């Protein structure tokens, strides 16, 4: 077979956009930089079949009140359970092993989720936490092109997550 | 004429590399956080005076790299210890028992120990559910708290707990 070489080149529109967001950082939802990523990455990535739960989850993600906890085997459990279970995903509504549980407020009940949902959600969340690090003065040792390519990486992970391409450990 | 005190406690920081010991230290003493901090070279210490049930407590907080080292100068004279793991990396928590072993072989056996409990700010990446670390700590007699040196949560509370407790058990004897 012939050889294909993986290459990487900065799109100048996204790059100038990001550099002009970097020059004056904000978490404001209407800033072009975030708006685009909301439309192309975040919204499709948090789109699930039960969607009041999905929108609650999105709000939880941008409010940083969302928490993801691993749930281990347990023969007995107090039940007030919709919230799904180890049997079934509370987000997509289907029967799969759920090795994770989700909480919106903390200040909320748990919802079991498939590893896939966990992957999408954690993709989005990682993006948000990095962007929040940038918005504050926390990132001082990373060059601008480095920062840019980290944003590209996160958008990569979210893009793959969108289409059903995810990782499970 | 401050930096004048009543009692002086030496607390050491222990745990795997990358759990946030040095940032816990800087957050408590200098209220600084370092997102990009590298691994610690040699040993370091900083001081901060706080006030405890009316009696002056000045804390001399010790810090060193997580991963042979001349291990017994660091522990020597330590009246308190902060055993630190990363909430988002279970392996750091699994090595807690071994940090404990090395905590009382090469150090004092009535040293005050608190389980931490760090990077609580990473909620979506949580590896160690609170119940399991609290089970382990309660069962091992250790006090337990969850901190984020990044967003400052429970840092003051943690240090003040271990300090109040060391103070209290230096009030007894
Ligand atoms: N999200 C988050 N990151 C943290 C927190 N505390 C430390 N970190 C990050 O985790 C990494 C390790 O921190 P550091 O304080 O150097 O750990 P350490 O225990 O001193 N390591 P060493 O044992 O090698 O000296 C750094 O990237 C630091 O910014 C925290 O509360 N939250
Ligand atoms: Mg260090």
mmCIF file of C-alpha atoms in Angstrom, chain A:
data_model
loop_
_atom_site.group_PDB
_atom_site.id
_atom_site.type_symbol
_atom_site.label_atom_id
_atom_site.label_comp_id
_atom_site.label_asym_id
_atom_site.label_seq_id
_atom_site.Cartn_x
_atom_site.Cartn_y
_atom_site.Cartn_z
ATOM 1 C CA UNK A 1 0.000 0.000 0.000
ATOM 2 C CA UNK A 2 1.112 3.615 -0.591
ATOM 3 C CA UNK A 3 2.083 5.797 2.360
ATOM 4 C CA UNK A 4 -0.126 8.525 3.784
ATOM 5 C CA UNK A 5 1.493 11.065 6.077
ATOM 6 C CA UNK A 6 -0.473 12.756 8.847
ATOM 7 C CA UNK A 7 -0.132 16.512 8.570
ATOM 8 C CA UNK A 8 -1.302 19.503 10.569
ATOM 9 C CA UNK A 9 -1.955 23.062 9.357
ATOM 10 C CA UNK A 10 -3.710 25.943 11.118
ATOM 11 C CA UNK A 11 -6.899 27.226 9.499
ATOM 12 C CA UNK A 12 -6.393 30.977 9.409
ATOM 13 C CA UNK A 13 -10.026 31.891 10.072
ATOM 14 C CA UNK A 14 -10.229 29.789 13.263
ATOM 15 C CA UNK A 15 -6.702 30.940 14.130
ATOM 16 C CA UNK A 16 -7.324 34.690 13.824
ATOM 17 C CA UNK A 17 -10.612 34.135 15.638
ATOM 18 C CA UNK A 18 -8.846 32.408 18.489
ATOM 19 C CA UNK A 19 -6.032 34.963 18.625
ATOM 20 C CA UNK A 20 -8.582 37.735 18.908
ATOM 21 C CA UNK A 21 -10.325 35.811 21.654
ATOM 22 C CA UNK A 22 -6.986 35.214 23.370
ATOM 23 C CA UNK A 23 -6.234 38.941 23.264
ATOM 24 C CA UNK A 24 -9.389 39.626 25.348
ATOM 25 C CA UNK A 25 -10.665 36.374 26.955
ATOM 26 C CA UNK A 26 -14.328 35.888 27.858
ATOM 27 C CA UNK A 27 -16.723 33.036 28.642
ATOM 28 C CA UNK A 28 -19.514 35.055 27.056
ATOM 29 C CA UNK A 29 -21.688 32.681 25.036
ATOM 30 C CA UNK A 30 -22.135 35.173 22.155
ATOM 31 C CA UNK A 31 -18.434 35.735 21.451
ATOM 32 C CA UNK A 32 -17.789 34.421 17.904
ATOM 33 C CA UNK A 33 -15.095 31.958 19.033
ATOM 34 C CA UNK A 34 -17.382 30.227 21.533
ATOM 35 C CA UNK A 35 -20.492 30.662 19.382
ATOM 36 C CA UNK A 36 -19.067 28.660 16.488
ATOM 37 C CA UNK A 37 -17.904 25.831 18.777
ATOM 38 C CA UNK A 38 -21.309 25.808 20.453
ATOM 39 C CA UNK A 39 -22.987 25.332 17.076
ATOM 40 C CA UNK A 40 -20.578 22.816 15.545
ATOM 41 C CA UNK A 41 -19.326 20.891 18.606
ATOM 42 C CA UNK A 42 -21.090 21.373 21.932
ATOM 43 C CA UNK A 43 -24.775 21.339 20.946
ATOM 44 C CA UNK A 44 -24.560 18.243 18.739
ATOM 45 C CA UNK A 45 -22.306 16.528 21.283
ATOM 46 C CA UNK A 46 -24.749 16.901 24.190
ATOM 47 C CA UNK A 47 -27.744 16.004 22.041
ATOM 48 C CA UNK A 48 -29.395 12.937 23.555
ATOM 49 C CA UNK A 49 -32.823 11.275 23.227
ATOM 50 C CA UNK A 50 -34.072 12.339 26.656
ATOM 51 C CA UNK A 51 -33.485 16.027 26.118
ATOM 52 C CA UNK A 52 -34.702 17.824 29.202
ATOM 53 C CA UNK A 53 -32.105 15.776 30.989
ATOM 54 C CA UNK A 54 -29.714 16.594 28.137
ATOM 55 C CA UNK A 55 -30.316 20.344 28.375
ATOM 56 C CA UNK A 56 -30.105 20.163 32.164
ATOM 57 C CA UNK A 57 -26.748 18.438 31.631
ATOM 58 C CA UNK A 58 -25.563 21.166 29.243
ATOM 59 C CA UNK A 59 -26.488 23.890 31.714
ATOM 60 C CA UNK A 60 -24.731 21.869 34.417
ATOM 61 C CA UNK A 61 -21.633 21.741 32.207
ATOM 62 C CA UNK A 62 -21.414 25.470 31.559
ATOM 63 C CA UNK A 63 -22.278 26.170 35.215
ATOM 64 C CA UNK A 64 -19.502 23.803 36.299
ATOM 65 C CA UNK A 65 -21.948 22.095 38.651
ATOM 66 C CA UNK A 66 -21.863 18.773 36.804
ATOM 67 C CA UNK A 67 -20.044 15.866 38.416
ATOM 68 C CA UNK A 68 -19.110 12.464 37.025
ATOM 69 C CA UNK A 69 -18.489 9.620 39.447
ATOM 70 C CA UNK A 70 -17.508 6.031 38.771
ATOM 71 C CA UNK A 71 -20.084 3.579 40.105
ATOM 72 C CA UNK A 72 -18.826 0.184 41.221
ATOM 73 C CA UNK A 73 -20.684 -3.097 41.732
ATOM 74 C CA UNK A 74 -23.083 -3.193 44.680
ATOM 75 C CA UNK A 75 -25.624 -5.992 45.414
ATOM 76 C CA UNK A 76 -27.743 -3.640 47.545
ATOM 77 C CA UNK A 77 -28.899 -0.061 46.966
ATOM 78 C CA UNK A 78 -31.378 2.356 48.521
ATOM 79 C CA UNK A 79 -33.787 3.407 45.784
ATOM 80 C CA UNK A 80 -35.687 6.619 45.130
ATOM 81 C CA UNK A 81 -35.410 6.059 41.372
ATOM 82 C CA UNK A 82 -35.704 8.098 34.738
ATOM 83 C CA UNK A 83 -32.475 8.125 36.725
ATOM 84 C CA UNK A 84 -31.561 4.970 34.830
ATOM 85 C CA UNK A 85 -29.544 2.236 36.493
ATOM 86 C CA UNK A 86 -26.568 -0.106 36.033
ATOM 87 C CA UNK A 87 -28.909 -1.697 33.509
ATOM 88 C CA UNK A 88 -29.594 1.340 31.379
ATOM 89 C CA UNK A 89 -28.486 4.802 30.261
ATOM 90 C CA UNK A 90 -30.496 7.679 31.741
ATOM 91 C CA UNK A 91 -29.512 9.875 28.803
ATOM 92 C CA UNK A 92 -29.892 7.742 25.662
ATOM 93 C CA UNK A 93 -32.446 5.353 27.180
ATOM 94 C CA UNK A 94 -30.820 2.051 26.216
ATOM 95 C CA UNK A 95 -29.587 -1.132 27.906
ATOM 96 C CA UNK A 96 -25.819 -1.007 28.366
ATOM 97 C CA UNK A 97 -23.345 -1.506 31.199
ATOM 98 C CA UNK A 98 -23.178 1.861 32.941
ATOM 99 C CA UNK A 99 -19.893 2.299 34.754
ATOM 100 C CA UNK A 100 -20.620 5.944 35.552
ATOM 101 C CA UNK A 101 -23.167 8.115 37.316
ATOM 102 C CA UNK A 102 -23.896 11.803 36.812
ATOM 103 C CA UNK A 103 -25.053 14.560 39.072
ATOM 104 C CA UNK A 104 -26.275 18.025 37.915
ATOM 105 C CA UNK A 105 -26.723 20.094 41.056
ATOM 106 C CA UNK A 106 -24.994 18.499 44.032
ATOM 107 C CA UNK A 107 -27.959 19.299 45.232
ATOM 108 C CA UNK A 108 -29.338 16.572 42.847
ATOM 109 C CA UNK A 109 -29.890 12.823 42.312
ATOM 110 C CA UNK A 110 -27.689 10.462 40.304
ATOM 111 C CA UNK A 111 -28.264 9.384 36.708
ATOM 112 C CA UNK A 112 -26.507 6.365 35.238
ATOM 113 C CA UNK A 113 -24.891 6.857 31.845
ATOM 114 C CA UNK A 114 -23.219 4.743 29.170
ATOM 115 C CA UNK A 115 -19.434 5.056 28.709
ATOM 116 C CA UNK A 116 -20.238 6.743 25.381
ATOM 117 C CA UNK A 117 -22.227 9.577 27.023
ATOM 118 C CA UNK A 118 -19.435 9.845 29.539
ATOM 119 C CA UNK A 119 -16.984 10.293 26.691
ATOM 120 C CA UNK A 120 -18.978 13.029 24.936
ATOM 121 C CA UNK A 121 -19.734 14.875 28.152
ATOM 122 C CA UNK A 122 -16.128 14.688 29.375
ATOM 123 C CA UNK A 123 -15.011 15.968 25.953
ATOM 124 C CA UNK A 124 -17.177 19.053 26.254
ATOM 125 C CA UNK A 125 -16.190 19.514 29.908
ATOM 126 C CA UNK A 126 -12.474 19.286 29.124
ATOM 127 C CA UNK A 127 -12.926 21.941 26.484
ATOM 128 C CA UNK A 128 -14.722 24.211 28.966
ATOM 129 C CA UNK A 129 -12.123 23.759 31.713
ATOM 130 C CA UNK A 130 -9.233 24.524 29.378
ATOM 131 C CA UNK A 131 -11.028 27.597 27.996
ATOM 132 C CA UNK A 132 -11.693 28.706 31.586
ATOM 133 C CA UNK A 133 -8.001 28.282 32.437
ATOM 134 C CA UNK A 134 -7.234 30.500 29.458
ATOM 135 C CA UNK A 135 -9.864 33.108 30.319
ATOM 136 C CA UNK A 136 -8.187 33.476 33.710
ATOM 137 C CA UNK A 137 -4.442 34.065 34.012
ATOM 138 C CA UNK A 138 -3.672 30.431 34.795
ATOM 139 C CA UNK A 139 -1.895 29.620 31.505
ATOM 140 C CA UNK A 140 1.413 31.487 31.290
ATOM 141 C CA UNK A 141 3.930 28.936 29.980
ATOM 142 C CA UNK A 142 2.073 27.926 26.821
ATOM 143 C CA UNK A 143 2.807 29.737 23.550
ATOM 144 C CA UNK A 144 -0.153 31.070 21.524
ATOM 145 C CA UNK A 145 0.152 28.404 18.799
ATOM 146 C CA UNK A 146 0.350 25.714 21.478
ATOM 147 C CA UNK A 147 -2.849 27.070 23.042
ATOM 148 C CA UNK A 148 -4.481 27.161 19.630
ATOM 149 C CA UNK A 149 -3.550 23.550 18.882
ATOM 150 C CA UNK A 150 -4.869 22.465 22.264
ATOM 151 C CA UNK A 151 -8.182 24.072 21.344
ATOM 152 C CA UNK A 152 -8.011 22.213 18.004
ATOM 153 C CA UNK A 153 -7.316 18.968 19.888
ATOM 154 C CA UNK A 154 -10.312 19.437 22.199
ATOM 155 C CA UNK A 155 -12.535 20.251 19.234
ATOM 156 C CA UNK A 156 -11.137 17.057 17.663
ATOM 157 C CA UNK A 157 -12.185 14.975 20.629
ATOM 158 C CA UNK A 158 -15.641 16.578 20.621
ATOM 159 C CA UNK A 159 -15.936 16.080 16.852
ATOM 160 C CA UNK A 160 -15.142 12.374 17.108
ATOM 161 C CA UNK A 161 -17.494 12.079 20.083
ATOM 162 C CA UNK A 162 -20.297 13.628 17.975
ATOM 163 C CA UNK A 163 -20.171 10.905 15.346
ATOM 164 C CA UNK A 164 -20.019 8.068 17.843
ATOM 165 C CA UNK A 165 -16.252 7.675 17.933
ATOM 166 C CA UNK A 166 -15.303 7.373 21.585
ATOM 167 C CA UNK A 167 -12.809 5.825 23.975
ATOM 168 C CA UNK A 168 -13.553 3.564 26.950
ATOM 169 C CA UNK A 169 -11.131 2.457 29.673
#
